[PDB]
Amino acid sequence: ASVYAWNRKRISNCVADYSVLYNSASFSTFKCYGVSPTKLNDLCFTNVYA
Amino acid sequence: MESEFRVYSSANNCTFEYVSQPFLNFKNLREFVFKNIDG
């Protein structure tokens, strides 16, 4: 989508594997604010907004 | 033939969807218990 009309997808009721994203070499920026990438794969959240 | 669904008119903001296997003189007796505890 365009940045003015950015797409928001709500992610619920599944298992989110963050190590697949973190260990990928295809991403230039993976800057996390407020949480560290190492403990993302352990913690649990109510909803994820993408 | 089932060809009439009139239960709703709209669906705006969904939080949870779950599709499962079917649960189902009077011949069948179906007992259900529904509880709302801690969400």
Ligand SMILES: *[C@@H]1O[C@H](CO)[C@@H](O)[C@H](O)[C@H]1NC(C)=O
């Ligand atoms: C719920 O739906 C209405 C209209 O469909 C929308 O304006 C509102 O932002 C929605 N709220 C959420 C939390 O999705």
